[PDB]
Amino acid sequence: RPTFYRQELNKTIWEVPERYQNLSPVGSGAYGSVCAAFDTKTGHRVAVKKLSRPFQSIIHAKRTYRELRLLKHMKHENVIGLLDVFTPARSLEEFNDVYLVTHLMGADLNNIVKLTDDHVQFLIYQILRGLKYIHSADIIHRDLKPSNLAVNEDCELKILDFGLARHTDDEMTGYVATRWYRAPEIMLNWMHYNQTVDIWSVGCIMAELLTGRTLFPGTDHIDQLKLILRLVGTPGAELLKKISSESARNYIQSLAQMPKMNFANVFIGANPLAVDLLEKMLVLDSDKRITAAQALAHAYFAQYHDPDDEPVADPYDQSFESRDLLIDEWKSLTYDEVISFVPPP
Ligand SMILES: CN1C(=O)C[C@H](C(C)(C)C)N1O
Ligand SMILES: [Cl-]
Ligand SMILES: [Cl-]
Ligand SMILES: [Cl-]
Ligand SMILES: [Cl-]
Ligand SMILES: [Cl-]
Ligand SMILES: [Mg+2]
């Protein structure tokens, strides 16, 4: 066990191993507080996150276990990895606090956008390489957007901030970036969704890198649907049958029919290969969208594609997701995963 020291950082007691020095507050959501620090053991600048109320309810206790399982599995150049996880507790009996350690990242894709064709190829290639890995483990990200994609000092892109099923009705309301990158089937609850929702989000991000403008900046759910159908066309009888929601189906049929627009006349002056890839990502019927593995082999990425250096994940057991347990059982499973952690090479 390392030695721990205590300090107060903005109304909060932080108890951390001596290796972590120069702690300074960076931010706080409602799921925890984050400090920047220097890790003297590795020489990395790191983000230390202290979870808030990790075991306060069955829903929260399971969310904590879900986030630690996910971060411990992800071992890929284009995905955030777990550098460390610790608790000052010496036993399960006194376990209350969980701290997660990851690489401090540089500029996100909002900061980058706010670019040549060569830069767009390079950045979308890395997102797709990381998504081929995530999807191979049957994980859906569910929240891809520019603020969840950042590059380090060497311009290596990493996917962060996986959807832990955490978004509130309020957070998705109105003129908000939290909704602009979502597939219509998840935005309006049309049907059981799958990993295809992440490729819709990649199409929206790629469009915004090419034009410097949000593709579907809707003022609310219905305004954003009208922007979407004006570009890709209203649904045919084949997709309407797959909308299992009867009243969602009824509303779509109230809209005047519109054809798919010419993407060369929308993305004026873009590489014709970029236009072709956008037409394959931005398809209303999710069964028909291009997959990450198929997109890596598209001619737009000829300069970067190497099928011997696009790895897949180890198998990932998510049987816990359908298990019903008490708060103290989720808390014991979480404690076991904290004490068994082995740091990267
Ligand atoms: C370090 N780095 C960035 O932050 C973006 C930049 C571009 C590929 C956009 C040029 N890359 O080199
Ligand atoms: Cl230490
Ligand atoms: Cl990492
Ligand atoms: Cl504790
Ligand atoms: Cl964003
Ligand atoms: Cl597993
Ligand atoms: Mg985020």
mmCIF file with all atom_site columns, C-alpha atoms in Angstrom, residues 82-210:
data_model
loop_
_atom_site.group_PDB
_atom_site.id
_atom_site.type_symbol
_atom_site.label_atom_id
_atom_site.label_alt_id
_atom_site.label_comp_id
_atom_site.label_asym_id
_atom_site.label_entity_id
_atom_site.label_seq_id
_atom_site.pdbx_PDB_ins_code
_atom_site.Cartn_x
_atom_site.Cartn_y
_atom_site.Cartn_z
_atom_site.occupancy
_atom_site.B_iso_or_equiv
_atom_site.pdbx_formal_charge
_atom_site.auth_seq_id
_atom_site.auth_comp_id
_atom_site.auth_asym_id
_atom_site.auth_atom_id
_atom_site.pdbx_PDB_model_num
ATOM 1   C CA . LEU A 1 82  ? -6.921  3.783  -17.204 1.00 0.00 ? 82  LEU A CA 1
ATOM 2   C CA . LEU A 1 83  ? -3.461  4.721  -15.787 1.00 0.00 ? 83  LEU A CA 1
ATOM 3   C CA . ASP A 1 84  ? -4.505  3.985  -12.096 1.00 0.00 ? 84  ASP A CA 1
ATOM 4   C CA . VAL A 1 85  ? -7.529  3.496  -9.757  1.00 0.00 ? 85  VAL A CA 1
ATOM 5   C CA . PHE A 1 86  ? -7.210  3.848  -5.936  1.00 0.00 ? 86  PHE A CA 1
ATOM 6   C CA . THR A 1 87  ? -9.073  4.118  -2.611  1.00 0.00 ? 87  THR A CA 1
ATOM 7   C CA . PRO A 1 88  ? -7.579  5.195  0.752   1.00 0.00 ? 88  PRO A CA 1
ATOM 8   C CA . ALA A 1 89  ? -9.723  2.412  2.404   1.00 0.00 ? 89  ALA A CA 1
ATOM 9   C CA . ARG A 1 90  ? -7.726  -0.545 3.922   1.00 0.00 ? 90  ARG A CA 1
ATOM 10  C CA . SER A 1 91  ? -10.792 -2.949 3.884   1.00 0.00 ? 91  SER A CA 1
ATOM 11  C CA . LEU A 1 92  ? -14.266 -3.425 2.241   1.00 0.00 ? 92  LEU A CA 1
ATOM 12  C CA . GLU A 1 93  ? -15.759 -2.374 5.639   1.00 0.00 ? 93  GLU A CA 1
ATOM 13  C CA . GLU A 1 94  ? -14.319 1.219  5.359   1.00 0.00 ? 94  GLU A CA 1
ATOM 14  C CA . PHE A 1 95  ? -14.632 1.550  1.487   1.00 0.00 ? 95  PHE A CA 1
ATOM 15  C CA . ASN A 1 96  ? -16.494 4.769  0.456   1.00 0.00 ? 96  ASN A CA 1
ATOM 16  C CA . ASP A 1 97  ? -14.292 6.627  -2.093  1.00 0.00 ? 97  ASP A CA 1
ATOM 17  C CA . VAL A 1 98  ? -13.098 5.796  -5.686  1.00 0.00 ? 98  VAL A CA 1
ATOM 18  C CA . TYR A 1 99  ? -10.441 7.852  -7.620  1.00 0.00 ? 99  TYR A CA 1
ATOM 19  C CA . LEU A 1 100 ? -9.742  7.313  -11.392 1.00 0.00 ? 100 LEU A CA 1
ATOM 20  C CA . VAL A 1 101 ? -6.450  8.430  -13.121 1.00 0.00 ? 101 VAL A CA 1
ATOM 21  C CA . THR A 1 102 ? -6.130  9.055  -16.931 1.00 0.00 ? 102 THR A CA 1
ATOM 22  C CA . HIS A 1 103 ? -3.725  10.963 -19.300 1.00 0.00 ? 103 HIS A CA 1
ATOM 23  C CA . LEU A 1 104 ? -4.237  14.772 -19.291 1.00 0.00 ? 104 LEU A CA 1
ATOM 24  C CA . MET A 1 105 ? -5.383  15.438 -22.912 1.00 0.00 ? 105 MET A CA 1
ATOM 25  C CA . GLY A 1 106 ? -4.698  18.515 -25.115 1.00 0.00 ? 106 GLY A CA 1
ATOM 26  C CA . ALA A 1 107 ? -7.186  20.343 -27.398 1.00 0.00 ? 107 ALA A CA 1
ATOM 27  C CA . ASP A 1 108 ? -10.584 18.705 -28.114 1.00 0.00 ? 108 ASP A CA 1
ATOM 28  C CA . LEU A 1 109 ? -12.102 18.763 -31.656 1.00 0.00 ? 109 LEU A CA 1
ATOM 29  C CA . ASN A 1 110 ? -14.214 21.868 -30.771 1.00 0.00 ? 110 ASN A CA 1
ATOM 30  C CA . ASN A 1 111 ? -10.958 23.813 -30.103 1.00 0.00 ? 111 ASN A CA 1
ATOM 31  C CA . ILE A 1 112 ? -9.428  22.419 -33.343 1.00 0.00 ? 112 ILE A CA 1
ATOM 32  C CA . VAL A 1 113 ? -12.507 23.219 -35.566 1.00 0.00 ? 113 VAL A CA 1
ATOM 33  C CA . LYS A 1 114 ? -13.050 26.633 -33.796 1.00 0.00 ? 114 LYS A CA 1
ATOM 34  C CA . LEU A 1 115 ? -8.072  22.291 -41.636 1.00 0.00 ? 115 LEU A CA 1
ATOM 35  C CA . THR A 1 116 ? -6.938  20.828 -45.022 1.00 0.00 ? 116 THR A CA 1
ATOM 36  C CA . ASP A 1 117 ? -8.491  17.680 -46.612 1.00 0.00 ? 117 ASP A CA 1
ATOM 37  C CA . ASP A 1 118 ? -5.294  15.885 -45.433 1.00 0.00 ? 118 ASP A CA 1
ATOM 38  C CA . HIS A 1 119 ? -6.121  16.877 -41.763 1.00 0.00 ? 119 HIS A CA 1
ATOM 39  C CA . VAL A 1 120 ? -9.753  15.636 -42.161 1.00 0.00 ? 120 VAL A CA 1
ATOM 40  C CA . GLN A 1 121 ? -8.524  12.227 -43.560 1.00 0.00 ? 121 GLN A CA 1
ATOM 41  C CA . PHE A 1 122 ? -6.048  11.917 -40.572 1.00 0.00 ? 122 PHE A CA 1
ATOM 42  C CA . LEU A 1 123 ? -8.572  12.801 -37.785 1.00 0.00 ? 123 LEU A CA 1
ATOM 43  C CA . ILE A 1 124 ? -11.593 10.763 -39.129 1.00 0.00 ? 124 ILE A CA 1
ATOM 44  C CA . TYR A 1 125 ? -9.238  7.743  -39.761 1.00 0.00 ? 125 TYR A CA 1
ATOM 45  C CA . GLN A 1 126 ? -8.236  7.744  -36.040 1.00 0.00 ? 126 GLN A CA 1
ATOM 46  C CA . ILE A 1 127 ? -11.911 7.980  -34.794 1.00 0.00 ? 127 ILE A CA 1
ATOM 47  C CA . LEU A 1 128 ? -12.841 5.000  -37.062 1.00 0.00 ? 128 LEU A CA 1
ATOM 48  C CA . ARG A 1 129 ? -9.749  2.936  -35.945 1.00 0.00 ? 129 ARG A CA 1
ATOM 49  C CA . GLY A 1 130 ? -10.786 3.455  -32.291 1.00 0.00 ? 130 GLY A CA 1
ATOM 50  C CA . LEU A 1 131 ? -14.505 2.682  -33.102 1.00 0.00 ? 131 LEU A CA 1
ATOM 51  C CA . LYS A 1 132 ? -13.607 -0.626 -34.952 1.00 0.00 ? 132 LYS A CA 1
ATOM 52  C CA . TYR A 1 133 ? -11.901 -1.622 -31.599 1.00 0.00 ? 133 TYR A CA 1
ATOM 53  C CA . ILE A 1 134 ? -14.883 -0.452 -29.322 1.00 0.00 ? 134 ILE A CA 1
ATOM 54  C CA . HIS A 1 135 ? -17.509 -2.134 -31.584 1.00 0.00 ? 135 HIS A CA 1
ATOM 55  C CA . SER A 1 136 ? -15.469 -5.449 -31.745 1.00 0.00 ? 136 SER A CA 1
ATOM 56  C CA . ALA A 1 137 ? -16.140 -5.733 -27.909 1.00 0.00 ? 137 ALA A CA 1
ATOM 57  C CA . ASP A 1 138 ? -19.933 -5.118 -28.482 1.00 0.00 ? 138 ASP A CA 1
ATOM 58  C CA . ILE A 1 139 ? -19.630 -1.697 -26.714 1.00 0.00 ? 139 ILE A CA 1
ATOM 59  C CA . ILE A 1 140 ? -21.726 1.265  -28.050 1.00 0.00 ? 140 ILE A CA 1
ATOM 60  C CA . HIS A 1 141 ? -20.247 4.744  -27.210 1.00 0.00 ? 141 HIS A CA 1
ATOM 61  C CA . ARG A 1 142 ? -23.699 6.481  -27.561 1.00 0.00 ? 142 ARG A CA 1
ATOM 62  C CA . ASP A 1 143 ? -22.305 10.078 -27.042 1.00 0.00 ? 143 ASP A CA 1
ATOM 63  C CA . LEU A 1 144 ? -19.715 10.825 -29.775 1.00 0.00 ? 144 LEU A CA 1
ATOM 64  C CA . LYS A 1 145 ? -19.320 14.598 -30.332 1.00 0.00 ? 145 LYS A CA 1
ATOM 65  C CA . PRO A 1 146 ? -16.361 17.022 -30.717 1.00 0.00 ? 146 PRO A CA 1
ATOM 66  C CA . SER A 1 147 ? -15.999 17.673 -26.910 1.00 0.00 ? 147 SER A CA 1
ATOM 67  C CA . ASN A 1 148 ? -15.512 13.841 -26.410 1.00 0.00 ? 148 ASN A CA 1
ATOM 68  C CA . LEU A 1 149 ? -12.543 13.596 -28.906 1.00 0.00 ? 149 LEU A CA 1
ATOM 69  C CA . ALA A 1 150 ? -9.114  15.102 -27.943 1.00 0.00 ? 150 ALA A CA 1
ATOM 70  C CA . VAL A 1 151 ? -5.481  14.892 -29.229 1.00 0.00 ? 151 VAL A CA 1
ATOM 71  C CA . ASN A 1 152 ? -2.241  14.648 -27.167 1.00 0.00 ? 152 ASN A CA 1
ATOM 72  C CA . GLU A 1 153 ? 1.117   16.450 -27.847 1.00 0.00 ? 153 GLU A CA 1
ATOM 73  C CA . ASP A 1 154 ? 1.902   14.134 -30.875 1.00 0.00 ? 154 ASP A CA 1
ATOM 74  C CA . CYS A 1 155 ? -1.611  14.759 -32.483 1.00 0.00 ? 155 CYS A CA 1
ATOM 75  C CA . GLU A 1 156 ? -2.779  11.205 -31.447 1.00 0.00 ? 156 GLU A CA 1
ATOM 76  C CA . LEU A 1 157 ? -6.646  11.358 -31.208 1.00 0.00 ? 157 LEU A CA 1
ATOM 77  C CA . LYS A 1 158 ? -8.424  9.547  -28.294 1.00 0.00 ? 158 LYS A CA 1
ATOM 78  C CA . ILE A 1 159 ? -12.147 8.744  -27.782 1.00 0.00 ? 159 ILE A CA 1
ATOM 79  C CA . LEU A 1 160 ? -13.260 9.600  -24.205 1.00 0.00 ? 160 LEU A CA 1
ATOM 80  C CA . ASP A 1 161 ? -16.405 9.969  -22.006 1.00 0.00 ? 161 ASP A CA 1
ATOM 81  C CA . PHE A 1 162 ? -18.348 6.790  -22.972 1.00 0.00 ? 162 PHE A CA 1
ATOM 82  C CA . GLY A 1 163 ? -22.181 6.996  -22.586 1.00 0.00 ? 163 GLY A CA 1
ATOM 83  C CA . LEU A 1 164 ? -22.879 5.509  -19.089 1.00 0.00 ? 164 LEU A CA 1
ATOM 84  C CA . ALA A 1 165 ? -26.680 6.041  -19.736 1.00 0.00 ? 165 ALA A CA 1
ATOM 85  C CA . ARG A 1 166 ? -26.520 9.358  -17.784 1.00 0.00 ? 166 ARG A CA 1
ATOM 86  C CA . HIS A 1 167 ? -28.254 12.112 -19.917 1.00 0.00 ? 167 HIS A CA 1
ATOM 87  C CA . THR A 1 168 ? -31.273 14.028 -18.456 1.00 0.00 ? 168 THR A CA 1
ATOM 88  C CA . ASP A 1 169 ? -34.393 15.227 -20.433 1.00 0.00 ? 169 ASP A CA 1
ATOM 89  C CA . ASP A 1 170 ? -33.338 18.852 -19.569 1.00 0.00 ? 170 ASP A CA 1
ATOM 90  C CA . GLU A 1 171 ? -29.768 18.304 -20.955 1.00 0.00 ? 171 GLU A CA 1
ATOM 91  C CA . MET A 1 172 ? -31.235 17.226 -24.390 1.00 0.00 ? 172 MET A CA 1
ATOM 92  C CA . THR A 1 173 ? -33.742 20.203 -24.603 1.00 0.00 ? 173 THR A CA 1
ATOM 93  C CA . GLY A 1 174 ? -33.432 23.140 -27.078 1.00 0.00 ? 174 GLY A CA 1
ATOM 94  C CA . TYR A 1 175 ? -30.477 24.616 -29.055 1.00 0.00 ? 175 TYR A CA 1
ATOM 95  C CA . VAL A 1 176 ? -27.791 22.294 -27.512 1.00 0.00 ? 176 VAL A CA 1
ATOM 96  C CA . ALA A 1 177 ? -24.657 20.463 -28.828 1.00 0.00 ? 177 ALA A CA 1
ATOM 97  C CA . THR A 1 178 ? -25.662 17.571 -26.475 1.00 0.00 ? 178 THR A CA 1
ATOM 98  C CA . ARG A 1 179 ? -28.301 16.527 -29.169 1.00 0.00 ? 179 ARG A CA 1
ATOM 99  C CA . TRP A 1 180 ? -26.857 17.760 -32.572 1.00 0.00 ? 180 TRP A CA 1
ATOM 100 C CA . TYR A 1 181 ? -24.698 14.587 -33.137 1.00 0.00 ? 181 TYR A CA 1
ATOM 101 C CA . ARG A 1 182 ? -27.395 11.961 -32.163 1.00 0.00 ? 182 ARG A CA 1
ATOM 102 C CA . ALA A 1 183 ? -28.902 9.450  -34.657 1.00 0.00 ? 183 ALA A CA 1
ATOM 103 C CA . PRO A 1 184 ? -32.645 10.132 -35.208 1.00 0.00 ? 184 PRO A CA 1
ATOM 104 C CA . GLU A 1 185 ? -33.609 6.591  -33.948 1.00 0.00 ? 185 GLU A CA 1
ATOM 105 C CA . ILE A 1 186 ? -31.996 7.343  -30.493 1.00 0.00 ? 186 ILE A CA 1
ATOM 106 C CA . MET A 1 187 ? -33.170 11.047 -30.478 1.00 0.00 ? 187 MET A CA 1
ATOM 107 C CA . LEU A 1 188 ? -36.900 10.068 -30.973 1.00 0.00 ? 188 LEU A CA 1
ATOM 108 C CA . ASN A 1 189 ? -36.881 6.490  -29.481 1.00 0.00 ? 189 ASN A CA 1
ATOM 109 C CA . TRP A 1 190 ? -38.009 4.908  -32.838 1.00 0.00 ? 190 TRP A CA 1
ATOM 110 C CA . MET A 1 191 ? -36.696 1.372  -32.092 1.00 0.00 ? 191 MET A CA 1
ATOM 111 C CA . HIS A 1 192 ? -34.095 -0.776 -30.240 1.00 0.00 ? 192 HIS A CA 1
ATOM 112 C CA . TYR A 1 193 ? -30.830 0.881  -31.461 1.00 0.00 ? 193 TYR A CA 1
ATOM 113 C CA . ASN A 1 194 ? -27.368 -0.738 -31.935 1.00 0.00 ? 194 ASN A CA 1
ATOM 114 C CA . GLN A 1 195 ? -23.700 0.249  -32.709 1.00 0.00 ? 195 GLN A CA 1
ATOM 115 C CA . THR A 1 196 ? -24.785 1.972  -36.033 1.00 0.00 ? 196 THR A CA 1
ATOM 116 C CA . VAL A 1 197 ? -25.779 5.089  -33.952 1.00 0.00 ? 197 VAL A CA 1
ATOM 117 C CA . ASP A 1 198 ? -21.993 5.869  -33.505 1.00 0.00 ? 198 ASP A CA 1
ATOM 118 C CA . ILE A 1 199 ? -21.437 5.974  -37.353 1.00 0.00 ? 199 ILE A CA 1
ATOM 119 C CA . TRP A 1 200 ? -24.224 8.648  -37.701 1.00 0.00 ? 200 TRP A CA 1
ATOM 120 C CA . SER A 1 201 ? -22.319 10.768 -35.110 1.00 0.00 ? 201 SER A CA 1
ATOM 121 C CA . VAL A 1 202 ? -18.996 10.292 -37.096 1.00 0.00 ? 202 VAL A CA 1
ATOM 122 C CA . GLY A 1 203 ? -20.811 11.566 -40.284 1.00 0.00 ? 203 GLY A CA 1
ATOM 123 C CA . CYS A 1 204 ? -22.000 14.733 -38.403 1.00 0.00 ? 204 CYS A CA 1
ATOM 124 C CA . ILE A 1 205 ? -18.418 15.357 -37.019 1.00 0.00 ? 205 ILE A CA 1
ATOM 125 C CA . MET A 1 206 ? -16.751 14.791 -40.462 1.00 0.00 ? 206 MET A CA 1
ATOM 126 C CA . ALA A 1 207 ? -19.235 17.256 -42.109 1.00 0.00 ? 207 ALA A CA 1
ATOM 127 C CA . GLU A 1 208 ? -18.418 19.936 -39.464 1.00 0.00 ? 208 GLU A CA 1
ATOM 128 C CA . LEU A 1 209 ? -14.607 19.422 -39.974 1.00 0.00 ? 209 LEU A CA 1
ATOM 129 C CA . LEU A 1 210 ? -15.111 19.975 -43.797 1.00 0.00 ? 210 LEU A CA 1
#
